[PDB]
Hints:
Its main location: cytoplasm. Zn(2+) binds at residues 93, 95, 118. This is Carbonic anhydrase 2. This protein starts with 14 loop residues before the first helix and ends with a strand. β4 (55-60) and β5 (65-69) form a beta hairpin. The protein has one domain (1-259): Roll (Carbonic Anhydrase II), CATH 3.10.200. It contains four helices and 15 strands. The protein is mainly beta. 8% of the residues lie in helices and 29% in strands. Zinc ion binds next to β7.
Amino acid sequence: SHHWGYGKHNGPEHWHKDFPIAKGERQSPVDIDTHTAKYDPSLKPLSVSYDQATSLRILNNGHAFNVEFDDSQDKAVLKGGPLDGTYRLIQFHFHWGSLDGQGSEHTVDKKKYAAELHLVHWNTKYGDFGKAVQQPDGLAVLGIFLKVGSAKPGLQKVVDVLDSIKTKGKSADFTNFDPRGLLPESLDYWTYPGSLTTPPLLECVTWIVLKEPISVSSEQVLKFRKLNFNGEGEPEELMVDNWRPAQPLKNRQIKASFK
Length: 259
Ligand SMILES: COc1ccc2c(ccc[n+]2C(=O)c2ccc(S(N)(=O)=O)cc2)c1
Ligand SMILES: [Zn+2]
């Protein structure tokens, strides 16, 4: 099984062979050109209601780690912004680099952040996640940039469990994590229509990318980089540089919620 990954032989420029939509019309991520993105006064404020969020578990899937939520009721929800309807939080994960100068998927005027957080939500009108990903308005992913400087106290709970899920296929109980602790002050955002940034690369995402990055410490991101792509008792490949680069914008407009 020579499966997709991020190395020289199985990384982003190889994905099209198995997933031809990789060269499609609405692929993510993209470079966000701040001078070309237009203020859209019709865009609403983003409504992030995470007060009843229920985390269940954390998993290393060999590509990143996913913190999963119970999405069997309208607990943690995203709405307003560019969205019509209600989208439920299912999981969050991050993408990061081998060094602080790279790691984000989206870029801002070609600037790369040290990492990027993705909070993944599905449109409740489609009833389940698997059905949502087959729809052009099926998912809403909230993207949040990470830069290195001061520690984020709301992240440390995640950092401290990574020891227990070092390799691919390991999981641990991860209850009562509050993702409000990962949010920046301002909910100003850019939005555009896009895709999942890993295979199957489905073109089903309304991207909402926050302008304000959060700060995490060097020590926090260092612990991300101690994870492993490989499974237990296999040769060690550190989980670093699990980001797809910017893809062509083609026939698409990036709108800003702010002036
Ligand atoms: C077998 O069960 C699974 C597991 C993961 C699946 C998935 C269906 C599509 C993509 N994924 C995702 O959940 C996924 C992949 C990428 C992104 S991203 N990085 O936010 O665009 C979000 C979500 C099914
Ligand atoms: Zn992602």
